[PDB]
Amino acid sequence: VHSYGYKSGTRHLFAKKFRKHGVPSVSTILTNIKVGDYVDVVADSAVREGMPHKYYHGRTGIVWNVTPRGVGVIINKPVRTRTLRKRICVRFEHVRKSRCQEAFKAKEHQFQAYLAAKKAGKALPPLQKSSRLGGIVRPKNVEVLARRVADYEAMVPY
Amino acid sequence: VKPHLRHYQVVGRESPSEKNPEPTVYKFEVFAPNFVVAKSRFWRMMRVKNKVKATHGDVLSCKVVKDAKLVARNYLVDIAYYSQRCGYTRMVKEFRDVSKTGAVSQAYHDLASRHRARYHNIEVLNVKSIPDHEVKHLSIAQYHAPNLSFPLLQRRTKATRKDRAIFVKKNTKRAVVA
Amino acid sequence: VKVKSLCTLQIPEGVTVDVKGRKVTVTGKRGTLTKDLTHLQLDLRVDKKNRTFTVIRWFGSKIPIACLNTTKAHVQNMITGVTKGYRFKVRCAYAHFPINVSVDGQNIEVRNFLGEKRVRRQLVPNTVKVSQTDPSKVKDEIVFDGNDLEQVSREAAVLHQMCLVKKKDIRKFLDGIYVQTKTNIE
RNA sequence: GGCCAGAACCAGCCCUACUGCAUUAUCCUGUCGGGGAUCAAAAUCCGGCGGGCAACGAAGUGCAAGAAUCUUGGGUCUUGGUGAAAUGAGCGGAGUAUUUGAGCUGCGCACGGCGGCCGCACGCACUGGUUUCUUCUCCGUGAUGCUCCAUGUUGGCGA
RNA sequence: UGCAAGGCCGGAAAGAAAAGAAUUAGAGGCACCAAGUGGGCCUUCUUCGGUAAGCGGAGCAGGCGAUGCGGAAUGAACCGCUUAGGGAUAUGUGGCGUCAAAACUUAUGGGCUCAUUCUCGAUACGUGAAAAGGGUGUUGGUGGAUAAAUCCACCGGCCCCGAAAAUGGAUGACGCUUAAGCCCAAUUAGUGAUUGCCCAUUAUUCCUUUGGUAAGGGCGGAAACAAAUGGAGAAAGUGUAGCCCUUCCGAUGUA
RNA sequence: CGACGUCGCUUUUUGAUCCUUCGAUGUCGGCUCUUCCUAACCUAGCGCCGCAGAAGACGCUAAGGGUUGGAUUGUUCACCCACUGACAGGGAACGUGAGCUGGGUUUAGACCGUCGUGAGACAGGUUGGUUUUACCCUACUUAGCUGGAAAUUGCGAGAA
Ligand SMILES: [K+]
Ligand SMILES: [K+]
Ligand SMILES: [K+]
Ligand SMILES: [K+]
Ligand SMILES: [K+]
Ligand SMILES: [K+]
Ligand SMILES: [K+]
Ligand SMILES: [K+]
Ligand SMILES: [K+]
Ligand SMILES: [K+]
Ligand SMILES: [Mg+2]
Ligand SMILES: [Mg+2]
Ligand SMILES: [Mg+2]
Ligand SMILES: [Mg+2]
Ligand SMILES: [Mg+2]
Ligand SMILES: [Mg+2]
Ligand SMILES: [Mg+2]
Ligand SMILES: [Mg+2]
Ligand SMILES: [Mg+2]
Ligand SMILES: [Mg+2]
Ligand SMILES: [Mg+2]
Ligand SMILES: [Mg+2]
Ligand SMILES: [Mg+2]
Ligand code: NA
């Protein structure tokens, strides 16, 4: 019956997309991974060397150690009543830089720029207004919404 | 008794966005017990017709339409109802009533009685006051007679609730237990 | 429902129709007839000056409306019976065994029906007169006479129904007592 | 009397009465033309056109905050009392006023036609004015009482 | 002077703006020592094997077990609600012809239905009783046709036929048919607005108990004050007849 | 009457399942005896027939009544002989063992055949092989005694 090997039930998981087959590209090689960075662990099916387990596909974590051809990532895994910090070792081809903190970093930089503008006395950008406020609506065209006899005939096939 | 359905005119639209800066404004005719049901029916119609969801639209008005002065009239109600085996069945009926809301409520009761149809499976297409000479059904046309009269027979006349009794003398009005 | 449904009948000069509580009585020459229609619940009016009998149904469906013409036909039958009466002529038809019918006062005895030894006896009510036509004019003919159509018939049928062929082909063995002519007496 | 019952009043509850604001127009009228049906009509019905509040027990439509104090509602054998600290718009002193709504109004500003003019149902500021009718407002009592218990009335029954 | 790492010294900090721009009956962590469990069973959906099975096997989550209470007459598990011990007042599911509380059979609501020996129907779950097929029963649609209104096909609704088992029997019993049946809609009825009524171990509130991850006050006798003829007590306190007072919240339960 | 299709019903058949019972609910047949069902064999009506008569077929309402004697076999069944108007089908813990009987099944003795090295095994054959208890409570069947309308009481008062 069902077996329990390392790669059981990965027929659609460890498969390349349609017309997107091939080994990793040059930009994947040239990417710099540092300790403390956030990375997504997505297995590249074409490499097959250093592939993570099927559980860690799609999980993101922080790299804890960098190695000539490998990367070690701390991934949270819930077992029973607590989550463990599993340190998995993969090849560099199975990790992508994570944009999870992109919005937070942009918010920090926006705050710093706003403080700089306030200190320098430059005029601040106008504040946004909610769309949930009231107002007078002047309609360009007003239509009548009603059910017609033809709708049932249209919905009835043959 | 006054009708259980009220005439609502629900005016609404989609919330303006960058793709639709000036959305179309739709007016809707509904007969509903309250304005919450009126708005629910309006948004159902907008979703199934104009592909507009209630979460992405707004309502400019949900007012009620006052009834005209009470006059014995003929009301043509074009209505439709859904059944599982029969699909959508559309019919046109004539009613004798004094108001549009009264005629539509009478139509809803008639559909429930004769076809086992509930409020949420019924869509009123139109209601209008038609002349005497355009009435097709004889059951409605029999009330157009200039001299129409009839006696009240087989009437179970009940006493006033304060004067009702359990035991009454046989040929007198004296109450023994009351 | 239909607010008003009517049926109107014309009363001849001799006969007078009287209605009271859905109980009709037609009195004229040759006798008097009475019918109890209290099970019908209709509005029965008689205009004596115009000699009309009207039966009305108010707010009636098809089932209640169906009784208007039945009541009109019943009253017409009573008028016709009071005026001219009813006469039913039945004939004894046989292949081999003659059917001997003897008529006493209000009593009919049938013998030798298909050779049977059993005698069939029928008692006729005093409101219906039974006679036997002499064989010189027409063979084996029995005449029922009376004002009530429902009473003149039934008698002609209890006579037909008592002489029924049993345990035999009825395509063959066609003998019996059959009503040939229904007519009046005046 | 530490019993039974009834009426009073307090306080707190819990029920009821008493209603204002906003809406309406597919509406309400009149009058013409049609159209309809009649013995003739009228009406149902549909167009113009002129008005407009169906009008507050108009509407069964939205929301209501109206001191049961004026103006002795009811209930509490569903609470505790009988003033052993009554905190009261309720007591007790003063005063005839006070401000707060509704009218009606000023100026600027928002707001609405239409492209700086017109409107403005009366928003906002001047806590603007007016006072025409609508309301009462203002003061007052620590515990030198740590805690608990202890204070009516009218009968019936108990000498 | 670049990177990488470990520091150090500054700087700034809506302590996270505005755009619908969170919420919390949110003290986070961290040990130690143990007990019962380790036959489970029911559903809603998803699902596999099997003709199925009150059959066997899974998924997610609830529930019985372990648990009463109010309701479906009766029923482990369905509906409502979950349980200190008492009151009042409200409800929920379910009801308001009698049994049986409540329409003393409500309306000044609209239609539909007549069912002769398992005797129409009326409680979801619970085919915890039924189809294929038929009806010139009645009353509603839809499309034609013809001209005093007809008749032709076609779809509903309720009723009827299909529809046979063994003790006498089960809408629940009686009964009901101007329903006490069915579909819809009211709340005193075109009068003037927006809560008919009746039933919980539920809600709200009141009283008492008990226990807190409980919250507070007071505790240096305040001055006075015999009897005959206001009184008592006041403990620096886990647990008592609990030191006293005030306040809040919880309270069922098999192993 | 009826393909091949299609929808049922039944629980007199086997199967499936494992819910009850393993500190025990007497296990086949027969006999006796009552009762119930109807999907009606006879018997009462009545339709229809390819229904002349006679004899039937098919259906309808109806379960009031009836439904036998034997040969072989433990049999239920089966089959045959014979009578009859007819010799219908079933249910009641596969009705009925403190009712019987015990032929069968299913101990221990023994024989055969086949199987086993054997002791032994057979859903194969054969022969021989303890059927306990009511005096209890109901239920039935008869047999006595005796109060009671506020069904014992109120004095609580209703005359076919
Ligand atoms: K009292
Ligand atoms: K429960
Ligand atoms: K009704
Ligand atoms: K306590
Ligand atoms: K202590
Ligand atoms: K036996
Ligand atoms: K051997
Ligand atoms: K043997
Ligand atoms: K033997
Ligand atoms: K033996
Ligand atoms: Mg165990
Ligand atoms: Mg109550
Ligand atoms: Mg009662
Ligand atoms: Mg203490
Ligand atoms: Mg406990
Ligand atoms: Mg035993
Ligand atoms: Mg036994
Ligand atoms: Mg019998
Ligand atoms: Mg047996
Ligand atoms: Mg026995
Ligand atoms: Mg025995
Ligand atoms: Mg033996
Ligand atoms: Mg007595
Ligand atoms: Na994939």
Residue ranges of E strands in A28-110? 38-41, 59-67, 70-79, 82-91, 95-97
CA-angle at C100, arms to C94 and C103, nearest 5°: 130
Whether B80 contacts chain A with CB within 8 A? yes
Of the candidates A141, A149, A156, which has its C-beta nearest B125's C-beta? A149
Nearest one of C156, C154, C128 to C142, comparing CA atoms: C156
Q: How far is CA A3 from CA A6, A53, A139, B161, C167, in A?
A: 10, 15, 66, 81, 84
Contact B60, B47 (CB under 8 A): no
Q: How far is CA A90 from CA A8, A40, A48, C162, in A?
A: 19, 12, 10, 110
* DSSP letter for each residue of B7-39: EEEEEEEEPP-SS-SS--EEEEEEEESSHHHHH
Whether B88 contacts chain A with CB within 8 A? yes
C-beta atoms of B150 and C2 within 8 A? no
Nearest one of C140, C114, C142 to C128, comparing CA atoms: C142
Query: Resolution of the coordinates in A?
Result: 3.0
Contact B54, B45 (CB under 8 A): no
Query: What tokens were used for C83?
Result: 């005026």
Query: What tokens were used for B33?
Result: 């017990």
**Strand, coil or helix: A52:** coil
Contact B129, B98 (CB under 8 A): no
Question: Tell me, what amino acid is at B124?
Answer: V
Name residues whose C-beta falls within 8 Å of residue A30's C-beta, 6 or more positions apart in sequence.
Answer: none
Nearest one of B94, B102, B45 to B71, comparing CA atoms: B102
| Type and span of the H or E element at A108 | helix A102-120
Nearest one of C6, C156, C177, C17 to C81, comparing CA atoms: C17
- Distance from residue B44's CA to nucleotide E181's C1', rounded to whole Å: 36
CA-based torsion, A127, A128, A130, A133: positive or negative: positive
* Burial of C108 per CB tally in 10 Å (0-12, 13-18, 19+): buried
Contact B80, B89 (CB under 8 A): yes
Query: What tokens were used for C71?
Result: 């009541």
- The rounded distance, in Å, linking the Cα atoms of B29 and B38 is 9
C-beta atoms of B42 and A149 within 8 A? no
Q: How far is CA B125 from CA A148, B35, B128, in A?
A: 7, 19, 10
Interface test mutation site (partner B, options C1, C2, C3, C44, max chain B beta carbons within 10 A): C3
Contact B88, B80 (CB under 8 A): yes
- The rounded distance, in Å, linking the Cα atoms of C100 and C111 is 5
- The rounded distance, in Å, linking the Cα atoms of B97 and C26 is 45
Bridge partners, C4 (sequence order): C58
How many angstroms does the Cα of residue B64 sit away from the middle of ligand 9? 100
- Examine chains B and C and say if they touch (3+ CB pairs below 8 A): yes
Experimental method: cryo-EM
Question: Tell me, what amino acid is at A8?
Answer: S
Per-residue burial over B41-63, b if 16 or more Cβ lie within 10 Å, else e, is: bbbebbeeebebeeeebebeebe
Strand-pair category, C52-60 with C86-93: unpaired
Residue with tokens 């004539």: B94
How many angstroms does the Cα of residue B124 sit away from the middle of ligand 5? 80
**Strand, coil or helix: A89:** strand
> C62-83 and C149-162 are packed helices; what angle lies between their axes, rounded to 10 degrees?
90
Chain B residue with Cα closest to A139: B25
Question: Tell me, what amino acid is at C79?
Answer: I
- The rounded distance, in Å, linking the Cα atoms of A119 and A103 is 24
Q: What are phi and psi of B172, to 5 degrees?
A: -120, 175
Nearest one of B95, B94, B85 to B117, comparing CA atoms: B85
Residues 35-64 of C with CB under 8 A from B: 58-59
Residue with tokens 């043959």: A158
How many angstroms does the Cα of residue B156 sit away from the middle of ligand 13? 24
Query: What tokens were used for A79?
Result: 């077992």
Strand-pair category, C2-10 with B175-177: unpaired
- The rounded distance, in Å, linking the Cα atoms of A98 and A41 is 9
Query: What tokens were used for B141?
Result: 């046309």
Give contacts of B143 with chain C, Cβ < 8 Å.
Answer: 3
Helix ranges (H only) for chain B are 35-50, 100-115, 138-141
Give contacts of A146 with chain B, Cβ < 8 Å.
Answer: 28-29, 45, 125
Question: How many CA atoms does the CB half-sphere of A88 hold within 13 Å?
Answer: 27
Of the candidates A143, A145, A149, which has its C-beta nearest B90's C-beta? A149
